[PDB]
Amino acid sequence: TAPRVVRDRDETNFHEMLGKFRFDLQGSFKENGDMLRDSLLQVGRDLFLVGWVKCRSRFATGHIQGDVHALSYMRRYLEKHVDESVSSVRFYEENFGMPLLEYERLSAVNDFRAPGKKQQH
Amino acid sequence: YITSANFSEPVELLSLAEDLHKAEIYTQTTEKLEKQWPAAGGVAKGIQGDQFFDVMAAAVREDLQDQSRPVLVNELTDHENPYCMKREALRRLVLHACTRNCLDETLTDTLLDRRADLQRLRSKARLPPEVLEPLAAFVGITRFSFDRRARL
Amino acid sequence: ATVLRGHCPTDKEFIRRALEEEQAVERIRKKLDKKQLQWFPGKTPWAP
Amino acid sequence: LNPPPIAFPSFNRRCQKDWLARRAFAENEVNGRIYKNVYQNLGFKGPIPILNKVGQYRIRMRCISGGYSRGIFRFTRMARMGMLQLAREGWLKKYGYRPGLF
Amino acid sequence: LQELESFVGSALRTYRLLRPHALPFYKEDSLLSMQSKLNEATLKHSPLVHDLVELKKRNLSVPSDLLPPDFNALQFSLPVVSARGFLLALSAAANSVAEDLEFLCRRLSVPNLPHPTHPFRLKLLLDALFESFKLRKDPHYAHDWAQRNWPRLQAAMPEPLSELSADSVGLWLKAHLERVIENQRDGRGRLLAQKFPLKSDEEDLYSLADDFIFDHEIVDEQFCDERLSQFPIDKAGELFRRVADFFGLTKGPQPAVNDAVVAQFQNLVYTLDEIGLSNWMKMDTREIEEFLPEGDPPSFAASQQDLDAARLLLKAAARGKANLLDFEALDPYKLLHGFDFKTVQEELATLPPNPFLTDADIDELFDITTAAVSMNASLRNFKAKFGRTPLEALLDSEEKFLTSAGPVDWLKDEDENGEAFVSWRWKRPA
Amino acid sequence: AFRYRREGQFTKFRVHFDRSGFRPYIDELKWEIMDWHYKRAMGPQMKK
Amino acid sequence: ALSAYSLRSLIVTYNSRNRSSMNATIENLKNALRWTSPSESSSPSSAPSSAPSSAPSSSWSPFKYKYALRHYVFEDHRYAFAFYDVNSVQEVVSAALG
Amino acid sequence: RVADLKLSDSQEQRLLDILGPERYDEQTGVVCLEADVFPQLNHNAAYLGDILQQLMREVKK
Amino acid sequence: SSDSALISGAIVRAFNPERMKVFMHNGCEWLWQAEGTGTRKRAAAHVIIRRGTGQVRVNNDEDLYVRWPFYYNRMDVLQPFFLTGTAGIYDLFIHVRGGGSSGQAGAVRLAVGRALVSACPACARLLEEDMVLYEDTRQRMPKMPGRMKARKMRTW
Amino acid sequence: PAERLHSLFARADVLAHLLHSRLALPLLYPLNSGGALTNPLNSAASPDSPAALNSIATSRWKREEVMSALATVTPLVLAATSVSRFLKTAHALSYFA
Amino acid sequence: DALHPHHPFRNHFGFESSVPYGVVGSISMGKGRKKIEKELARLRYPTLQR
Amino acid sequence: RSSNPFCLLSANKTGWLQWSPKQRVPFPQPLGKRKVGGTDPQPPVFPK
Amino acid sequence: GRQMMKWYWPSKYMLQDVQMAQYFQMQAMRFAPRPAHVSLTTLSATMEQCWKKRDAVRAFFQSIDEKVLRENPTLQDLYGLYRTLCPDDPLRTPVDPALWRDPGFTWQHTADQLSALAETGLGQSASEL
RNA sequence: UUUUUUUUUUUUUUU
């Protein structure tokens, strides 16, 4: 687990680093956010996403991790290239350069609560 | 890297002057030969006539192209089709050091298709043997050879 | 002349003559194939 | 721990015995028709004891990544666990396998 | 700040609809990087590249004269056509289309003052003013409208539909408008979904795109399926011939010979399909008119080198191949190596003839001498801006993303005479 | 009536394996899966 | 007579196991056209052949009374093309295979 | 096609009788002869050409 | 009579010459020929209307009561005619392929209903009382796997 | 107007509308994500020895590109407001009773 | 008829094809055609008269 | 040895093929946390 | 017999050994030439023999009518090759109907009859050490 | 169809 202090430069290692994404969406969505979740999953597979994501009617956040260069494209896609209406984009934290990764597969957390408890809640 | 035949620099030197540089020489030679050694008409019609001056001219072109086939160093398959030699030459160079991400590796196939240079040689290849051979047997003739070299 | 962009240059009459032949061979092949289709090939009634 | 290396099955005496009968039947396949032809021409029905040990029906389905002789199909040629491991390792995608449909 | 960013995001949506058969923005960008790196790798050890280096040490720039041809241009190790040459070819080709205004408007129905002859554009301004002669706000005022337009339309019309006076037309028009409004009170998918409210437009057009529908209580069911689901493009030629004959009966002011027009009109429809013509059928052409970058007219000197270079662009583009990169005699690989490089593109590549436009007479119909040098004011809507032009803001955001792609902030180092340099710098986290 | 959504139903439950256009896949995978291990074990060893 | 023969038609069919793979072939075939010597290139007709599918069945974990099942879908794709008056055999056969 | 092939009344009837109605279509009026008794393509192709000539020898009688 | 010149002069030639045969303004106002299509369950239909007071033939030159011997089935494939008053004016031709006994009857109601609207836009509002234009795209649910032999048939 | 309509109005308009080469390409063709990488050759771009072989001027020379893009966006609006609108008129009138 | 004394007949021999044969790479690279396979490679079609 | 002129192996005149020293897209991509069988030479160990 | 054999996995103790001795031999023999010329050798050193006996074969076709030319594989080829050495040779009034022999107008016979960029590259090639 | 027929309907297809 050698840090970037060993010899990363602009020759060949400039595109050999990992990190975490930074995004926090907020605003109303069509139906219950089904369109946004489906669109994000298809694009995420092409970029070989590892982290997870959360989608809902209003709340939309998550933690996405991957390559330093791969995540750069997603920043522009999820800021202007949005078919739905977006109010504003927030940020929580970011970090570039880290040995190995935490997650292994891309998945979206969905509300699988039973319908019986929905009325009580 | 004690020896001078295994460093990163020498590998690149032989990967351009022998892979891409040699491929272009064969490509131009094949096209140039066809201009100076034309045929009576269509390639398909020339086999059904069994006429002289067509079997002879075609045979000469086959030997000239074979003698003018450079031997690739990095590639050991030794392909005979000029279209395939150029298509595969770029794949080896692109996979050496061209890409910068996982996605770029998967998009290598699309890069070759977008290039207009490779699209010109797609419609120029050898006729498969199983084109006229079945038809010849139908009429029941035992005096025709599909191969041009053997026919002469 | 009167040639469109994405269209076949061949005459329409030639296609109609050739198209009918293809439909005839397909019908004959299906009829003959169904006749020679039975379990245990080579078995015939009261043959032994 | 470490899932099995699916390319090389473990040792199994019963599994090897099934393949032994296949070779014997192939060489004796010609003799099987001769025995039926002579009886048919003469018009007499009789047994053929020699076909018991070299018969085609002696061989049955078996699992290649296994050694059990049950639960094997002609399409996959694998047991319940053989298909699960092969499909989950990422090997059937090239062969048109979409698990999305039920 | 918030309004400026919103316009940039909305503008990108219009450009996406113009590229139906193309990869997304995140796919084409990656491909360009591979092409740029491939050119450098292939041209690293070229004989020409090494020859120039040795000449500098020996203090001998040019021994006799220029070796290379005066038609090539390489930027960032990528092939690019002349920027100035494209404008001349595009303007000259599009200028001949507007020539029909003389025999359609300047001789039949003068639209007041159409423009000066050719100020800058002469392409879209003509249509904007000519189409502004038909206005309608209140149905009660429709009677007076027929008294100011009937006389002008009494020439280019069928004989049976020309004997009536202005008052006769008004009687039917007055009753027709009332029926449409009453019926407008599966019809909601083409009334509020397509119309774009502005709050500033006091009146709206009639009988243009979607105003002539809903005449009766009930409309056709299958009609809607051919506008939203998919527009039938195969019948483009059939409809055009069935409408053109109404104006031209072969015995009126129009010529008596018209047969080859239908065959050629079909090609224009197929060519526009790639641009995204099918998308405009479903969505009303309102977003493109409003949400679109704009700027000042071009201004440059037409040099002799650029004037002759534009001729080749109009030659190969007449057959359908409007791209110079796909043709030979442009690849730098064969130029720096001494391969079989020639200028036979006009005979070898241009083998397929075009027996519909012309055989060997392109400059005759398309006058290249026009515009060019003679080309050397703000619009009504373009003037109202916060200094920065709409196009300047759009490119500013795009440049900040492509240039800043990664653990990066590639900086400003020289801003003079257009030339500039870039480098690398570390980026700290927040 | 959904026509495209029900495509391939006829050749899923009312067709024989030997009387259909579907080709086997086990034959190709037999020689493909085995070769993968050969290149992995002998790959680094040959270079060393 | 052999010299009196002529290729009346050439029905070209494809069989792809993936959606993306089939789409790549269509684009590649189109690019090979619009480059022949004659003014109009050979433009074959399209004829889809549906999409056959297969999915066997198996009992589902062992030591169970058949309470659940797991299916394995194996879709397929097909495509057919038609040709008429193939004057140039080299410019058609090579393009289809390439 | 039988219609294109010019033959006498007696000869025309025998052509369809030997092959039977299975290899004859009453709609268009064409006869298809299929031969596949060999695994190889070349071997099978030559076989068809031999039987075809023999059929015409007996038809004209 | 200037109003009729603009209306009658535009229907002829020009955009769509098909709409040229009418039976006065009041009482029929129906087109000479019309077409309609209807889908219900695993079946299809194609009904065409033509002028004539003849009988009703479905296919293979047969009568109507043969396909639908039941009384309720025959009434469903003729309900729109009674409401519109075309009881004995226009002919009826029903062509179907597949389905069942009562499955094909429903497709005819949707097919014939879509034909009358095309022939007369005005004669479409009165047909909403009986819900003729309404269809049923939903189909039978699949048999779930497991122990249940049927969709929800339990066992001991 | 017989010799200026047969092959002038239905043919020449196609040439002006054939802008797919400049429209299909990306907005930033000469600049990509890897534009500041080692793509330029160090032996032919660093010392500035050559003059025509290479030219690193695509970072601030947007004036030429801005003018080129401006001329390609005006004709697009005309096609949608003249061609698409004209077709809709025939389609709508094809079902008028 | 004199082409083969062991098979006195008019037409027995055909022509050889130019179809590639053999394995691209395996333990049987140097196999080509079998002893019995070469006979049918130079004949129009196999028979059962021998 | 097929007669396809566009094939990549039909024109192979030798029994040796190049091996990629580095790969960024592993062919045997798992669908989860499961590893590839036969990729653990060293035996495991338990805390005991 | 052949259907049941297709089962189980193949043998594993018959794979090619990775021997370094055989690796060097393959590389050394990879750059071998191809001096086959099986077809060219047959045609070569044959035209001279026909030229020596040109007068002897000149009368062969005079006594043979066109209708007698039934064996084209031996006669048609001979006639075509003969005309290559002697383009002009009128034997008699009757001639081929452009079917069995197409002499054409622009044929090939035994008797025989770079740019600024490329030229500039050669001048500077052998000018640096 | 006033020298016309002489009749029940299925689970892929007229691309």
Author numbering:
A (entry chain HS): 78 to 198
B (entry chain HF): 1 to 152
C (entry chain HC): 191 to 238
D (entry chain HD): 1 to 102
E (entry chain HJ): 149 to 333, 338 to 528, 536 to 589
F (entry chain HI): 1 to 48
G (entry chain HC): 1 to 60, 82 to 119
H (entry chain HP): 186 to 246
Verbatim from the authors:
Our study reveals how Toxoplasma gondii assembles over 40 mt-rRNA fragments using exclusively nuclear-encoded mitoribosomal proteins and three lineage-specific families of RNA-binding proteins. Cryo-EM analysis of the mitoribosome structure demonstrates how these AP2 proteins function as RNA binders to maintain mitoribosome integrity. The mitoribosome is also decorated with members of lineage-specific RNA-binding proteins belonging to RAP (RNA-binding domain abundant in Apicomplexa) proteins and HPR (heptatricopeptide repeat) families, highlighting the unique adaptations of these parasites. Our results reveal the structure and composition of the most fragmented rRNA mitoribosome to date.
The LSU was resolved to 2.89 Å, and the entire mitoribosome was locally refined to three bodies, the SSU head, the SSU body and the LSU, at resolutions of 3.6 Å, 3.29 Å and 3.11 Å, respectively. The first striking feature is the relative size of the SSU compared to the LSU, as the former appears substantially larger with an elongated oval-shaped head. The SSU harbors two particularly protein-rich regions, on the top of the head and the bottom (foot) of the body. On the top of the head, a cluster of mainly three large proteins (mS29, mS139 and mS141) form a tight domain around two short unassigned leftover rRNA fragments (ulr22 and ulr23). Interestingly, the universally conserved uS3m at the entrance of the mRNA binding channel is absent in the T. gondii mitoribosome and is instead replaced by the C-terminal and N-terminal tails of mS151 and mS148. Finally, one must highlight the absence of the conserved uS7m at the exit of the mRNA channel in T. gondii, a position that seems to partially overlap with mtAP2-1. Also, uS5m is substantially enlarged in this mitoribosome, as it has acquired a large SSU-head domain and N-terminal and C-terminal extensions on the SSU body. As anticipated, mtAP2-1 on the SSU is located at the head-to-body junction near the platform. Specifically, mtAP2-1 interacts mainly with fragments SSUB and SSUD with its first AP2 domain binding directly to the 3’ end of SSUD and interacting minorly with SSUB, mostly via arginine residues with the RNA backbone.
